[PDB]
Design a binder for these strands. Structure first.
Lengths: 211, 141, 161, 52, 135, 166, 206, 85, 118, 116
RNA sequence: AUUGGAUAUGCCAUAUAAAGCGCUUUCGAAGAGUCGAGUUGUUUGCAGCUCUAAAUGGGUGGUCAUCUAA
RNA sequence: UUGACCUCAAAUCAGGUAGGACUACGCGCUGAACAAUAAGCGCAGGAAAAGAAAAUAACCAUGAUUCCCUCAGUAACGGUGAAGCGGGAAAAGCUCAAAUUUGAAAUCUGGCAACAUUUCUUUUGUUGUCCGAGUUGUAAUUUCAA
C-alpha cells in the first residue's frame, strides 16, 4: 500500500552539487539531529526542482531539505512541505559544526528535542508559517525509527534583526538542581538563518513573500 | 499528501544487530526491558562445541542470544554467494520478443531526394574513359 | 671547458668557422619587381612603405611614430559604394596600371566547346529550338548526361562565341 | 659573474672536532696533494668567493 | 565473502529485498549450468567477481576454524614455554678518551691503538665546553 | 550503413547478445597471449571512428591488463613496446571480466608507402610522433594528464623575473 | 596426447558455443537455408556477378578507343554487396532478396540484419559460409548479398526463389529463431554432469 | 544600441532526434535484449511494484532523471510486447 | 508579496492542532518576547537565549511531569550519541589544554608577586 | 630561479628583422592583416573600441566578400563572433569596404585547356 | 657551385571536368564501460573499484545565456 | 573427391624498421628527507608541448594556442595564492567517424618493365603490366562555421 507504520512527519534531505566541506558537515550534523530524515545522493538539476516532489512521493518523505550552494560560496537551504505546501528559501551564515573546539554539548542521537520558538514568530504571517513548518520538521514524531525515548536537548529559534538564530542546547542535571537546573550547553549547531523568499507551491509556484 | 509512511522495503529500520555487553538499556518511552536469563551453560557450551548450520555469530541488541540463518536465508546466501539468480524460478532465457519488428514499415527510412547520378551513365567511368583515351593517343597503352 | 670543447681545443683540425652575422643588414626584396626597384636598402620597411605609397599595416600602430620635421545609420552606408581610392605616388600608380593591363590580357575567360560538347548541344537544339531549356533538360534520350537547363544554357552561349 | 658551481665541484666535509684541525671541510681520498686540503670557504684556496 | 554476506543478512544491516535486487547483475546472468570442466575451472579462478570482505567476518571464520584441540593445556603451556626459553636463551646470547696530540694530531678516522666507542679532544673545545656550561 | 547499428548496439553492453559475446570473447582472449595480433578489429565501427582504415600499414593489437594508472594507458604503452617499429594511433576498450580489461590498440607503420603517401596520416611519420603514448600524447594520455579546455583544467611562479630597468 | 594450442582453442570454441545458452539473435544463425534452395539462389546470383577488374578494364578501353577514333548504353545489372551498401538498400526498401553469411566472425556485424530485414519486409535467408558469397562477387568473403533489380527475363526466377525462401526459411523456423540456442549436450555428458551436480549439491556448496 | 535577432547556429541543433536514429535504436533495443537490471526492473513493473522498480533504477543508474527515463523506456517496452503478445 | 490573508490561510491549512498534547509535539512558544536590541553585543545575546531556554525548558518539564514521561536520561543508558566519542576525547584534550594554560597563567601571576616579595 | 632580461634589446631587434624578412617575401602587401573593431566585454571597458580577431560571416556577406576569398586577400574570418547589434555590423562592414577601396589585387595566371 | 619564390615565353593540358556565390513546395547522419552516480586514493582535475546513461540531449556558467566532450 | 574461406604457424623468404648515445631547454611517470623539489624511470624535437572552445562572460559583449606586461599579493582559501577582463608579441587554419560511387573500388602496396629525374650514377618519381590489399569499406564528397 502507501506505507507501513505511518510516522507523522518524514524528511527528505538532498545536497546539490557544489557544496563545500563546511556545508556538507552542516547537512550531516543536521541529519544526525533528525533521525526521521532520509539522506539521498546529489541532484543533477540546479534549476529543475520539481523533481523533488517525485523523490518525496517515492520515498514517503513529506518534508524536503535542499542544500543549494551557488558559486561555491553562498549556501542556501530550501525547506518545503513536499506535497504542495510552502517552499521557503533561506540563506545560511556563520557555520559552526560538531568538530569545532568550543562546543561541548551532548544529546542522544534521535531523542525527541524540546522546540522553543521566539514570540516574534507569531507577529508576521510569514514568520508564523516558517515557525509552523520548522516545528513540523524538527519536532521528532513519536515512533520514528532510530529515535531515543528520553529527552536531552532543546532547539532554540529566535528572530533578531530579521535573521533567524538557530541554537541547539543540551540539558544537564545540575548537582544541586534547586532553581530549574536546565544548565544548557551549546551542542554545536550554530548558524544564522535569513529568509529570502517563500513560494506557495512545492519548490515552485508564484512567490507569496519577498524579503 | 504522501502520509510520510514507511514502505515495507525501506532501507531504514529499527534494531540493527551487530557482532560481539548486552544492549538492554531501555525501550521506547523509556522502560527497562527484562534481561532474558543467560542460557543453560550446558546448552551454550553445546552450541559453542557444534556451531549451528549457518552460524552467523550475530546477536541482536535486545536479546543476548545469537542470530542464525534459517533454511531460506541459507538458500538465499547460497545463490547470492555463488553468483546466480537469487530467484528460484526466474527465466534468464526468455523467448525472443519482437516488440518493434513484429510489423512492416511501409516507407523507406530516408526522405532524402534521389540524385541524378543514379539515372545518368557513370561519371567515374567517363573520367576513366577519357584518361584511357588520352593514354591511347600518347601511345602509353 | 667541456670535454667536447677541450677535445677540439687540443685538436689540430680547424674550427668550422662560418661568417654569417652582420647586424643592421635588412632583408633584400624578392617577390615584387616594382617594389624591389624602388626599395632603398637603408630605410626601414615602415619608411619604405610610406615613401612608396603603401600601408605597412591596415591597423593602428602600437607606439609613437617618428617626427623628423616640425609638422605644419546602417542602411545608407551599408548600401553605399566606396569610390575606389587615389594613387598618391608613382609606384602605386605603376602597380595599378600593371594590374589593369594584366587583367585586360587575362580577361577572355569564356571557352569554346569541344567536339563532344558541340555535338551534344547541337543535337538538343535541332529538336527543341533554342529557348525551351526546360524541355531539353527533361529530354531523356538526347540529354543522357541529365544536364539541367542552366547547364544547357551555358553550353549554348559557349557555342555562340 | 662567476660560475655558480665554482668552488663546489669538489667533495669534502669537516673532519670533526677534537682533532686539532680547523673545522673547515677537507678534501677526502688520498694519493694526491689535494687530499686533506681545505675547501668550501672564502678563506680557502680553490674555495668559493664570499657572496659570488 | 560468504560470511560478510551472511552477516549482512542476519544483522539486518542490508535489507534482504535490496540484497535480492543487487543479485541481478552481469555475473549472475552468466549461468554455469552445464559448462565443461576445462571452461568452468578457469572461469572460477579468473572470472569470479571480487566482493568485499569485512574484519568481523574474518574473525568469524577464525572462530569457526578454531578446532576443539587447537589450544589445549600443553599447546598453550609448553608451546608458550619453548618460545619463552628461546627468548631467554637469545637474551643471554646477546667511550675511550683520545687527546689530539703527538701522533694523534690531524686524524680523520679511527686512530692507532683505539677500539670501540671513542671521543676526541684537542684542548680547543675546552673553551667551548665552558661556554656551553655557562649557557 | 551498418556502422550506426554497431554504434547503437555497443551501448547495450550488458544485454543478452553483448553479455553472451563478452563471455565467449573474454574466454578466447585469455587462451591467447597477453598481447596478440588481431586479424581485424572486433569493433570495426569503434576502430574507424578512432582513425583506423582497412588499408595496408594499419595494425590492430589486442592486450589484456589486470584491473584493481589507467588500464587504457597501460595497454598502449605495453603494446607500443611490443611493436617498436609502429606508431600508436589510438586504443579502445573491447571487453572486460572480473580480472582483466581488454583493449585493442591501433598502430600505423611509418615505413610503409601506403602511409607515407597518404596525406591524411603523413603527420605520424614525422619524427615528432615517436612514442606518443610514452609522452602522454594519445587520447587517453591527454585526458590522464589533465590537458583540456576550460576552467576545470608552475615555473612562472617559482621564478623571479628581474628586468633591466627595475 | 598434446594438441597444439590453437587447435585446442578452435575445438573448445566449437563445443563452448554449443553448450552455452545462445541468445536468439545469435542462435538464428545456426539455422540456415537448405541445400536445394541455396543451390537455386546461387544459380540466380551467378547470372548477376559483377564484372571482374580485368573485364571492366576491357570494356572501358573499348569505349576509350571509340572516343579516341570515332564516336546510349543500358544500366548495368548485378548483385549488390558490401555491408553498408546493403543496409542502405534494405532501409531504402530496394532489396528484393538479402543473403546473409552464417559465419561472420564479429557476429554484431550482421546480428541485427535479420530483424532489420523483418522490419522492412525484405525477403532474406541465412546461407552457408561467407566464402560462397565471396565467390559470387569475386572476393574472398561477403558478409551479405542483395538482389535489388534483375532483368525482365529473370523476374520469374527471382519470384520463384523468393517464394522458396519464404516457405523453406521463413515459414520454417520462425518459432525456432525466437528460442535461445545452445544447451546442446552430449549423450553421456548429460549423465556425467548429473553425477557432478548431485555430488556438488551434497556437500560441495561453500 | 539596436538589437538584432540572430538565427540558430548548426551546433545548437545537436541533441535533436533523427527519424533514422530513432529507428536504429528501436531495432537495436529489440535485437540486443536487456541488461540484468532491466530484466529485474521490468519484472517489478509487471508485478506492479512500481515504487520498488523506481528505487532500483535510481540505485543502478545514479540519478532520478536517468531512472525516470529508463522506467518510461522499459514501461513502453512492456506495452509494446503486450500489443504484439 | 507579503500577502497576509493567504499567508494566514495556509496557516490554517497546515495548522498543527492546538489540542495535541505537548509530548506529541515538544514545541513551546515562550510567553516572554525576549528582546535583545544590541544584536552586535553577542555576549548579551547568549544570556537572552539562555534565559529564554531555561524558561522554555521549565514550562516543558512542568507539562511533561503530568504527562508521565521520563525526563531524565538514566545513568545506565549507553545509546549512540550525536557526537562521536572519538572527537569527544579530542574536545576533552582541548579543554584540559585551556585549563592548564589558564592554570599556568594564574600561577605565573602569583610568581610575579612571589619573586618581588621573596 | 631568476629570469633576467639581458636579451631584451636583442629580442626587439630579432622581431624587427622578422618583419623585414616577412616584407622581403610578401613585398607589396601589408605585413599585418586587417583586424575588425570590437567592443571589450565588461562594464568597465565597453565604452572603448579595440581590435578583434576576424570579421564575422554576416559582416563579410554584407560587404560582398565571400568567406573563401576573404582569406586570400588578407581579411581574417571569425566564425565564433556574431553581430548582436547593427552598430557592430555597420562599424565593421564599413571597415571592410574602406579596405577594399584601398586594395589593389594583382591578377593570377590561369590554366586554359585548348578544347572545351 | 647549388638552390628559393615570382616574372616573361615555348610546348603540353585526360575541361564529356572541377569550384565559389545565389536560390529552395527536398534533406541534414554528429564519437559509450564514456558521461554520470556511489565510494576509496592522490592533488576542482585525475586514478582504482562497484554501478552505469541520454537525445534539443549533454557540458558549463548565471527560466536564461553559452558551449558541443568522450 | 575436388575446391573455397577463416584462424594459426614457418622460412638466413622479398623489402623495411626498432634499440644505444647526447640530453641545456621539452613531454610523460615516479617521488623523499628536510616540494608537482632532488634523486630514479620512460620518450622527443630544433624547438617541445599547447591549440581552432563540451571557452569566457553577464557586457554596447569577447572569441584557437602560446608568450610578455597588467590584473595582483587581488579574489578565494586558511601563510598559501589564481583567473576573466585590459595592453602588447605573433597570428592560420583545419582533417576525420557517423551518408548508397552503387549507372559500375572510382582507391592503394608490391613484382617486373621501360622512361625520366637528382645536392646525388648515391636522390626522387612517372608510365605500363602483373600478382595482391580492399566491400568486415579503399577513393571522391561532408565536419555543424555547416
Amino acid at each position: 500500500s502507501a506505507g507501513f507504520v505511518p510516522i507523522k512527519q518524514k524528511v527528505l534531505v538532498l545536497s546539490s552539487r557544489g557544496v563545500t566541506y563546511r556545508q556538507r558537515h552542516l547537512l550531516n550534523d543536521l541529519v544526525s539531529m533528525m533521525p526521521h530524515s532520509k539522506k539521498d545522493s546529489k541532484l543533477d538539476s540546479k534549476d529543475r526542482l520539481y523533481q523533488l516532489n517525485e523523490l518525496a512521493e517515492l520515498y514517503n518523505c513529506n518534508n524536503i531539505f535542499f542544500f543549494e550552494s551557488r558559486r561555491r560560496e553562498d549556501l542556501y537551504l530550501h525547506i518545503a512541505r513536499a506535497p504542495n505546501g510552502p517552499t521557503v528559501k533561506f540563506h545560511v551564515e556563520n557555520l559552526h559544526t560538531m568538530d569545532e573546539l568550543n562546543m561541548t554539548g551532548n544529546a542522544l542521537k534521535g531523542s525527541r528535542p524540546i522546540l522553543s520558538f521566539d514570540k516574534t514568530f507569531d507577529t508576521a504571517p510569514h514568520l508564523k508559517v516558517v515557525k509552523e513548518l520548522l516545528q513540523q520538521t524538527f519536532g521528532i514524531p513519536k515512533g520514528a525509527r532510530r529515535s531515543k525515548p528520553f529527552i536531552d536537548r532543546v532547539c532554540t529559534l529566535t528572530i533578531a534583526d530579521g535573521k533567524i538564530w538557530f541554537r541547539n542546547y543540551e540539558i544537564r542535571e545540575n548537582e544541586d538542581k534547586s532553581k530549574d537546573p536546565v544548565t544548557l550547553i551549546e551542542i554545536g549547531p550554530r548558524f544564522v538563518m535569513t529568509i529570502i523568499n517563500i513560494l506557495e507551491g512545492s519548490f515552485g509556484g508564484p512567490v507569496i513573500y519577498k524579503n | 499528501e504522501i502520509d510520510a509512511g514507511y514502505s515495507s522495503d525501506s532501507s531504514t529500520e529499527d534494531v540493527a544487530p551487530g557482532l560481539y555487553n548486552l544492549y538492554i538499556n531501555y525501550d521506547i518511552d523509556g522502560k527497562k526491558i527484562t534481561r532474558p536469563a543467560t542460557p543453560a551453560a550446558l546448552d551454550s557450551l553445546i552450541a559453542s562445541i557444534d556451531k549451528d548450520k549457518g552460524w552467523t555469530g550475530i546477536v541482536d541488541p535486545m536479546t543476548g542470544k545469537p542470530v542464525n540463518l534459517t533454511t531460506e536465508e541459507l538458500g538465499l546466501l547460497k545463490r547470492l554467494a555463488q553468483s546466480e539468480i537469487p530467484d528460484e524460478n526466474f527465466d534468464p532465457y526468455p523467448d525472443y520478443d519482437d516488440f518493434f519488428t513484429n510489423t512492416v514499415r511501409e516507407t523507406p527510412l530516408s526522405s532524402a531526394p534521389e540524385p541524378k547520378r543514379r539515372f545518368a551513365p557513370s561519371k567515374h567511368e567517363q573520367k576513366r574513359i577519357l584518361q584511357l583515351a588520352y593514354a591511347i593517343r600518347k601511345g602509353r597503352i | 671547458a667541456n670535454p667536447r670543447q677541450r677535445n677540439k681545443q687540443r685538436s689540430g683540425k680547424p674550427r668550422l668557422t662560418r661568417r654569417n652575422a652582420n647586424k643592421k643588414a635588412k632583408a633584400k626584396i624578392y617577390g615584387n619587381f616594382v617594389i624591389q626597384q624602388n626599395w632603398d636598402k637603408h630605410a626601414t620597411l615602415r619608411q619604405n612603405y610610406a615613401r612608396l605609397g603603401l600601408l605597412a599595416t591596415p591597423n593602428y600602430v602600437t607606439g609613437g611614430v617618428e617626427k623628423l620635421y616640425p609638422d605644419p545609420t546602417l542602411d545608407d552606408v551599408l548600401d553605399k559604394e566606396i569610390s575606389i581610392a587615389p594613387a598618391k605616388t608613382e609606384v602605386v600608380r605603376q602597380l595599378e596600371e600593371e594590374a589593369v593591363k594584366k587583367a585586360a590580357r587575362q580577361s577572355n575567360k569564356m571557352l569554346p566547346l569541344s567536339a563532344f560538347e558541340h555535338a551534344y548541344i547541337q543535337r538538343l537544339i535541332n529538336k527543341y529550338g533554342t529557348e525551351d531549356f526546360e524541355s531539353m533538360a527533361k529530354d531523356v534520350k538526347l540529354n543522357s548526361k541529365l544536364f539541367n537547363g542552366s547547364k544547357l544554357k551555358n553550353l549554348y552561349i559557349r557555342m555562340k562565341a | 659573474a662567476v660560475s655558480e658551481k665554482a668552488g663546489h665541484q669538489t667533495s669534502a666535509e669537516s673532519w670533526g672536532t677534537g682533532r686539532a684541525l680547523a673545522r673547515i671541510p677537507r678534501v677526502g681520498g688520498g694519493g694526491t696533494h689535494r687530499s686533506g686540503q681545505a675547501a668550501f670557504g672564502n678563506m680557502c684556496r680553490s674555495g668559493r668567493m664570499f657572496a659570488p | 565473502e560468504a560470511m560478510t554476506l551472511a552477516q549482512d543478512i542476519a544483522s539486518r544491516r542490508k535489507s534482504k529485498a535490496d540484497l535480492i535486487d543487487e543479485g541481478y547483475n552481469r555475473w549472475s546472468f552468466q549461468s554455469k549450468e552445464g559448462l565443461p570442466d576445462w571452461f568452468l575451472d578457469e572461469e572460477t579462478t579468473v572470472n569470479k567477481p571480487n566482493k568485499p570482505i569485512t574484519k568481523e567476518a574474518v574473525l568469524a571464520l577464525r572462530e569457526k576454524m578454531k578446532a576443539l584441540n587447537a589450544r589445549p593445556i600443553k599447546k598453550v603451556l609448553e608451546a608458550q614455554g619453548r618460545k619463552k626459553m628461546r627468548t631467554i636463551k637469545r637474551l643471554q646470547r646477546v667511550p675511550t678518551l683520545v687527546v689530539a696530540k703527538g701522533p694523534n694530531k690531524g686524524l680523520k678516522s679511527r686512530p692507532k691503538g683505539v677500539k670501540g666507542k671513542y671521543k676526541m679532544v684537542d684542548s680547543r673545545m675546552k673553551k667551548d665546553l665552558r661556554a656551553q656550561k655557562r649557557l | 550503413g551498418a556502422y550506426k547499428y554497431l554504434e547503437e548496439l555497443a551501448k547495450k553492453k550488458q544485454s543478452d547478445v553483448n553479455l553472451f559475446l563478452s563471455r565467449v570473447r573474454a574466454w578466447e582472449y585469455r587462451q591467447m597471449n597477453v598481447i596478440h595480433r588481431a586479424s581485424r578489429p572486433s569493433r570495426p565501427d569503434k576502430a574507424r571512428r578512432l582513425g583506423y582504415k582497412a588499408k595496408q600499414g594499419y595494425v590492430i593489437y589486442r592486450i589484456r591488463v589486470r584491473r584493481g594508472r589507467s588500464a587504457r594507458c597501460t595497454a598502449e604503452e605495453r603494446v607500443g613496446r611490443y611493436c617498436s617499429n609502429l606508431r600508436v594511433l589510438n586504443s579502445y576498450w573491447v571487453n572486460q571480466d572480473a580480472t582483466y580489461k581488454f583493449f585493442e590498440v591501433i598502430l600505423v607503420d611509418p615505413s610503409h608507402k601506403a602511409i607515407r603517401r597518404d596525406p591524411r596520416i603523413n603527420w605520424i611519420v614525422n619524427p615528432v610522433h615517436k612514442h606518443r603514448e610514452s609522452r602522454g600524447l594519445t587520447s587517453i594520455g591527454k585526458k590522464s594528464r589533465g590537458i583540456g579546455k576550460g576552467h576545470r583544467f608552475w615555473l612562472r611562479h617559482n621564478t623571479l623575473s628581474l628586468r633591466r630597468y627595475r | 596426447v598434446k594438441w597444439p594450442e590453437y587447435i585446442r582453442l578452435q575445438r573448445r570454441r566449437k563445443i563452448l558455443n554449443l553448450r552455452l545458452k545462445v541468445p536468439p539473435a545469435i542462435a538464428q544463425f545456426q539455422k540456415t537455408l537448405d541445400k536445394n534452395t541455396a543451390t537455386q539462389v546461387f544459380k540466380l546470383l551467378n547470372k548477376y556477378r559483377p564484372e571482374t577488374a580485368a573485364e571492366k578494364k576491357q570494356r572501358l578501353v573499348a569505349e576509350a578507343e571509340a572516343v579516341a577514333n570515332g564516336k546510349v548504353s543500358k544500366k548495368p545489372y548485378n548483385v549488390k554487396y558490401g555491408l553498408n551498401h546493403v543496409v542502405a538498400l534494405i532501409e531504402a526498401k530496394k532489396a528484393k532478396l538479402v543473403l546473409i553469411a552464417s559465419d561472420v566472425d564479429p557476429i554484431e556485424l550482421v546480428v541485427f540484419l535479420p530483424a532489420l530485414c523483418k522490419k522492412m519486409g525484405v525477403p532474406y535467408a541465412i546461407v552457408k559460409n561467407k566464402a560462397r558469397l565471396g565467390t559470387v562477387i569475386h572476393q574472398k568473403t561477403a558478409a551479405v548479398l542483395a538482389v535489388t533489380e534483375v532483368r525482365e527475363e529473370d523476374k520469374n526466377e527471382l519470384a520463384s526463389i523468393v517464394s522458396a525462401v519464404d516457405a523453406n526459411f521463413s515459414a520454417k523456423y520462425d518459432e525456432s529463431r525466437r528460442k535461445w540456442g545452445g544447451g546442446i549436450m552430449g549423450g553421456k555428458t548429460q549423465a556425467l554432469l548429473a553425477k557432478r551436480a548431485k555430488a556438488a549439491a551434497a556437500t560441495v556448496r561453500l | 544600441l539596436t538589437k538584432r535577432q540572430l538565427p540558430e547556429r548548426p551546433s545548437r541543433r545537436k541533441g535533436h532526434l533523427s527519424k533514422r536514429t530513432a529507428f536504429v535504436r528501436s531495432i537495436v533495443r529489440e535485437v540486443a535484449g536487456f541488461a540484468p537490471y532491466e530484466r529485474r526492473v521490468m519484472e517489478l513493473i509487471r508485478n506492479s511494484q512500481d515504487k520498488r522498480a523506481r528505487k532500483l533504477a535510481k540505485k543502478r543508474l545514479g540519478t532520478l532523471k536517468r531512472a525516470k527515463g529508463k522506467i518510461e523506456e522499459l514501461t513502453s517496452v512492456i506495452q509494446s510486447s503486450r500489443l504484439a503478445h | 508579496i507579503n500577502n497576509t490573508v493567504a499567508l494566514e490561510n495556509i496557516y490554517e491549512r497546515i495548522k498543527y492542532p492546538d489540542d495535541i498534547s505537548f509530548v506529541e509535539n515538544q514545541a513551546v512558544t515562550t510567553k516572554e518576547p525576549i528582546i535583545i536590541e544590541n544584536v552586535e553585543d553577542d555576549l548579551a545575546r547568549e544570556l537572552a537565549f539562555y534565559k529564554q531556554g531555561v524558561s522554555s525548558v521549565k514550562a516543558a518539564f512542568a507539562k511533561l511531569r503530568e504527562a508521565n514521561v521520563l525526563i531524565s536520561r538514566p545513568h545506565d543508558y549507553f545509546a549512540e550519541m550525536l557526537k562521536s566519542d572519538d572527537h569527544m576525547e579530542k574536545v576533552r584534550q582541548e579543554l584540559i589544554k585551556e585549563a592548564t594554560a589558564k592554570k599556568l597563567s594564574q600561577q605565573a601571576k602569583k610568581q610575579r608577586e612571589l619573586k618581588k616579595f621573596g | 630561479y631568476v629570469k633576467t632580461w639581458f636579451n631584451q634589446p636583442g629580442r626587439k631587434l630579432r622581431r624587427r628583422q622578422a618583419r623585414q624578412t616577412k616584407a622581403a617575401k610578401i613585398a607589396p602587401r601589408p605585413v599585418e592583416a586587417i583586424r575588425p573593431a570590437v567592443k571589450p566585454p565588461t562594464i568597465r571597458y565597453n565604452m572603448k573600441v579595440r581590435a578583434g580577431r576576424g570579421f564575422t560571416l554576416e559582416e563579410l556577406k554584407a560587404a560582398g566578400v565571400s568567406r573563401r576569398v576573404a582569406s586570400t586577400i588578407g581579411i581574417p574570418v571569425d566564425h565564433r563572433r556574431r553581430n548582436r547589434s547593427e552598430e557592430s555590423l555597420q562599424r565593421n562592414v564599413e571597415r571592410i569596404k574602406v579596405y577594399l577601396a584601398h586594395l589593389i589585387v594583382f591578377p593570377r595566371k590561369a590554366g586554359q585547356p585548348k578544347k572545351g
